[PDB]
Amino acid sequence: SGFRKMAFPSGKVEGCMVQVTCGTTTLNGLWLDDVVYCPRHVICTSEDMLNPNYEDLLIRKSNHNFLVQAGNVQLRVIGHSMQNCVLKLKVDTANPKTPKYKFVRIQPGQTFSVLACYNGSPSGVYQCAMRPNFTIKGSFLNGSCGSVGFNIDYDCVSFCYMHHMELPTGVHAGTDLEGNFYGPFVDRQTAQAAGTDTTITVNVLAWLYAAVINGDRWFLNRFTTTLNDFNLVAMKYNYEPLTQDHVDILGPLSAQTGIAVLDMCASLKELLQNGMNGRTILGSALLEDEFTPFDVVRQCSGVTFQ
Amino acid sequence: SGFRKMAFPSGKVEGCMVQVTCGTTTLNGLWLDDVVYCPRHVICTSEDMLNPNYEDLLIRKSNHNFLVQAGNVQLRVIGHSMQNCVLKLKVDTANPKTPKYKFVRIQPGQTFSVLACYNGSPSGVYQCAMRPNFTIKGSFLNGSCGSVGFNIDYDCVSFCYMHHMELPTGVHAGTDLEGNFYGPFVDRQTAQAAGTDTTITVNVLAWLYAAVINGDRWFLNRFTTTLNDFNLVAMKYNYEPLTQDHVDILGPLSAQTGIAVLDMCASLKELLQNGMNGRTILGSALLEDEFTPFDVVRQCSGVTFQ
Ligand SMILES: *C[C@H]1CCc2ccccc2C1=O
Ligand SMILES: *C[C@H]1CCc2ccccc2C1=O
Ligand SMILES: [Cl-]
C-alpha cells in the first residue's frame, strides 16, 4: 500500500544523454541510433533569443561547429538538419545503449517522467503532466534544455517531450521529439503568457480511486450525480469537462473498488464545494491531478518493465 | 525555477537488481561485486512469518536452494550467510555493472530515492524520508521486498535502505544494507505499532527557503523569534525540536536568500498557528518535510552525478 508520485526508471534514458555545445551555449542532446536530437536554440546567443532567424543563424554553422560528447569521449558529427524546433545531428557512431523507442506526441492530461540533465549528465528524475494549457510544471535551471520526458511500456521508451523554454511565470514549455512545440509557444524570449491552468478532472477521479484502494475513504459520501450536473460544478472550479470517454477509461478502477464513476463524481463535487476541512487524502491537502488512470493501476498492481 | 520531488537517476541501481527465489517466495536482491543481498525472510513461508526462527529455517537451506536470476540468465550461488536480517549470497560472477558504492546507515530526517522492483525488474522510482519514528512512507506491494533506497553523490551510490515489511497501518519498515532494522521493528508478522510521526522541522524550513527562491513569498512576515520560543510552538504541533546544529545547516540557504534562519522560523510559527488560509506553497497546501537542506541546494543549483 501507499501511493507516491512515481517516475519510470531512468537508466534506459541516461544512456542516451549527451552534451551538445555550439560556440556559445551547452545544453543536452538525445543520442538514439546515429542521430543526436537537441533544441535548435543551441545555435543562439542569449542575445539572439530575443528575435532569432534560425535558418539564417544556421547558415553559418557546419558539422564541426557542433561539439557532441557522450561522457568524456567526443562524437563525430557527419551531418546536421533542422526539423521544426529541433536539430538532428547525424553522428558516425550508433549509440550502443539505444533502447527500443518511439516518438509520441502526447495529449494534455497525460503524464510522463522527466530526466533533468545538465552538461549531458543526469541530475534527477521526477513526474510531470502536460497541462491543459500545454505547459508543464517542471524543475529546470539554465542548461537543462534538451532534457526529455518519456514513458516506458515493456521494453520500449516512448519519448514525448524535449525541454526548451522557461516562461516568465516559472512554468515550462517544449516540443515533441519531432520539434513541434506543445501549445502555442515559440523558442523566442518574448511575451507569451500561459492560459488558464485547468484541473485534469479524470486524473483527480483516478487519484480518488487510488485513495480508496490505499485506505483513505472519508470523502466517500452518500450522493451520486450526472455528467451534466457534475460538469456545471466542474466549470465553476475551472475543471476539465468530464466526458463519457473519461468515464469509460475509469471503468477498471470503478470495478476494482466497487464505486460507480458517477458516485465518485458526487464525492469530488462535495470536495470542491466544501473543501477538505483540514483533512488530507493520500498525504495531500489538495486534489491531485497529475496521476492518470493508467498511472493508478500501474502503481497499485506493480507492473514491470524489462 | 520550479520545485519538484526529485529522485536520483536510477540507472546505476537498476543494473544491480536481481530476482531471488527460495522454494516459496520470490523477492528482489542487490547484486554488488560477487555478493547478492536480500531480506532473510525470503526463506519463509507466509505461514512462517508469524513467528520464524530464521537460524533453524536456514539449516534446511543450501546454496542451490537460492535461485538468483539477473534478467534471464541464472547466477551460480557458491556460498550463503545470514548477517542480522539480510542474507548475503556469494555468487561466482562479479556484477559487471557494479557502481562505486558505499553502505550508509542514515539518520531520521534524511531523504533517499527508492527504486521499487518486482521479480528483480524495476517498476518506478520515488523520493522518501526516514521518518523520526523510523518508518518510511513508501509505495510497496507484495514482492517489492528487497527494493533498496539510495543516494548518489558524484560517481558513488550510497545504499541506505532495503525494504522488508509493511505494517498494518500501511507504512513501511526496513534495514540498512548490513541488515539492521531502522527503529524497533522486526521481520515478523506481529503487533508492532509506529510511534508519533513527528514533522522534520529543519526540512520544512529548507522547503520554505526553496519557496522563496522559486517565487513564493507570501508567507514571509515581519516577525522574528528565538530557538526556545519557536520550539514551544514546535512541540505543540509535534514538530522536531530545532537545534543550533539545524540552524547552522541552514546557513547556506539563509545566505542565498538573505532571510535569517530565525526570521524564517517566525514565518513557520505563524503558518502553524494560523494555517495557510487556502493558499499554497510550491504547489502544496501543507508544509512539506521530506526535502533536506542539501536536497534544496542540489535542486536549485543543478548538481551533476557522473
Ligand atoms: C532551457 C533553459 C533555458 C534557460 C533557463 C534559465 C533559467 C531557468 C530555466 C532555464 C531553462 O529551462
Ligand atoms: C515486502 C512486502 C511483503 C508483503 C507485502 C504485502 C502487501 C503490501 C506490501 C508488502 C511488502 O512490502
Ligand atoms: Cl511528489
Curated annotation (Swiss-Prot), chains A, B:
Where in or outside the cell it occurs: the entry states: Host cytoplasm; Host Golgi apparatus; Host nucleus
Q: Which reaction does it catalyse?
A: TSAVLQ-|-SGFRK-NH2 and SGVTFQ-|-GKFKK the two peptides corresponding to the two self-cleavage sites of the SARS 3C-like proteinase are the two most reactive peptide substrates. The enzyme exhibits a strong preference for substrates containing Gln at P1 position and Leu at P2 position
Activity regulation, per record: Inhibited by pyridone-containing alpha-ketoamides compounds 13a and 13b. In turn, alpha-ketoamide 13b (tert-butyl (1-((S)-1-(((S)-4-(benzylamino)-3,4-dioxo-1-((S)-2-oxopyrrolidin-3-yl)butan-2-yl)amino)-3-cyclopropyl-1-oxopropan-2-yl)-2-oxo-1,2-dihydropyridin-3-yl)carbamate) inhibits SARS-CoV-2 replication in human lung cells. Inhibited ex vivo by michael acceptor inhibitor N3. Inhibited ex vivo by compound 11a and 11b.
> Position of cross-link Glycyl lysine isopeptide (Lys-Gly) (interchain with G-Cter in ubiquitin)?
5, 90
Q: Which residues lie on this side of the membrane: Cytoplasmic?
A: 1-306
Impact after mutating residue 49 to A: Does not affect ability to cleave and inactivate human TRMT1
Question: Residue limits of the Peptidase C30 domain?
Answer: 1-306
Question: Catalytic residues?
Answer: 41 (for 3cl-pro activity), 145 (nucleophile)
Give the domain of life.
Viruses
Functionally, this protein is described as follows: Cleaves the C-terminus of replicase polyprotein at 11 sites. Recognizes substrates containing the core sequence [ILMVF]-Q-|-[SGACN]. Cleaves and inactivates human TRMT1, preventing tRNA guanine(26)-dimethylation of tRNAs. May cleave human NLRP1 in lung epithelial cells, thereby activating the NLRP1 inflammasome pathway. May cleave human GSDMD, triggering alternative GSDME-mediated epithelial cell death upon activation of the NLRP1 inflammasome, which may enhance the release interleukins 1B, 6, 16 and 18. Also able to bind an ADP-ribose-1''-phosphate (ADRP).
**How would you summarize the oligomeric state and partners of this protein?**
3CL-PRO exists as monomer and homodimer. Only the homodimer shows catalytic activity. Interacts with host FBXO22; this interaction promotes the proteasomal degradation of nsp5.
- This protein is called what? 3C-like proteinase nsp5
Organism, as annotated: Severe acute respiratory syndrome coronavirus 2
- What lineage does UniProt assign to this protein's organism? Viruses, Riboviria, Orthornavirae, Pisuviricota, Pisoniviricetes
